[PDB]
């Protein structure tokens, strides 16, 4: 499974020392490109993309997002006038990209949002822009009259796939790498309750299975997971907690399942 995702944001209040327009690209959930309204240029974020792309590619990419920046700049005023709003903090969000699944076939998407709520979504099957809100009917009329659907469905099904197929090939080692996590368990006694915490430090890829084991048997009672949180170097972190009786700290163990480990690693105090 391989995914390509391009997300854009048009802000009214960023606010101090921050750009109003931010555009970023993703390959299998990894940041590879960045664009901001202050610098006005598309920059590489990973080593595999910069070593495999020329300046002529980035000059072409900069021109595209520069035109997209001015369209989203106009969208902030058009939507404010339509909703009859005067000033304040308003946002325009764009979600575009394609996904390659295990037959499976191709899944393409192009959807927008205003003030964190769904506005419009493109349906490649019917070749029409679906309006989610009653204020999205004037958007549907102007978008379909422009004839964008004819070129957008060809992009999401062929061009988007063609770009993603080579991006995976460029960083095949950078995406297929394995990093072993540093697992450490801790115990803290509160108001007559012993809270045990298990943390995994710097693992790659993102999928991980972390569970608790009391006296050899897996116990999910009073268990809380903080999900998968990213680090500044590309690796991932996870935090799991369990509420137990005081003095029963030695009974509990942390079961960690990852691609880097051939067998599940059991960790104790």
């Amino acid at each position: 499974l391989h995914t390509l995702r391009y997300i854009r944001t048009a802000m009214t209040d960023p606010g101090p020392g921050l750009p109003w327009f931010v555009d970023v690209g993703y390959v299998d959930g990894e940041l590879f490109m960045h664009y901001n309204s202050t610098a006005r240029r598309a920059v590489p974020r990973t080593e595999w993309i910069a070593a495999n792309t020329d300046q002529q590619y980035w000059d072409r990419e900069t021109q595209i997002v520069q035109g997209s920046e001015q369209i989203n700049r106009e969208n902030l005023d058009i939507l404010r006038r339509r909703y009859n709003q005067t000033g304040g903090s308003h946002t325009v969000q764009w979600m575009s990209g394609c996904d390659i699944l295990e037959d499976g076939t191709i899944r393409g998407y192009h959807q927008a949002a205003y003030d964190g709520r769904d506005f419009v979504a493109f349906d490649k099957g019917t070749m029409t822009l679906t309006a989610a809100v009653p204020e999205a009917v004037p958007t549907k009329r102007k978008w379909e009259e422009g004839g964008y659907a004819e070129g957008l469905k060809q992009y999401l099904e062929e061009t988007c796939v063609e770009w993603l197929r080579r991006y995976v090939e460029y960083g095949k080692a950078e995406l297929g790498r394995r990093e072993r996590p540093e697992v450490r368990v801790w115990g803290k006694e509160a108001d007559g309750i012993l809270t045990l915490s298990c943390r995994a430090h710097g693992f790659y890829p993102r999928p991980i299975v972390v569970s608790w084991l009391k006296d050899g048997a897996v116990r999910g009672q009073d268990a809380q997971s903080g999900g998968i949180v990213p680090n500044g170097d590309g690796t991932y972190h996870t935090w799991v907690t369990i509420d137990a009786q005081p003095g029963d700290g030695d009974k509990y163990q942390c079961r960690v399942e990852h691609a880097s480990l051939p067998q599940p690693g059991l960790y104790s105090w």
Partner: peptide, 11 residues
């Protein structure tokens, strides 16, 4: 790998 047609973002 952005789409050439940036007009598809019009609202």
């Amino acid at each position: 790998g952005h789409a050439e047609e940036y007009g598809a973002d019009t609202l």
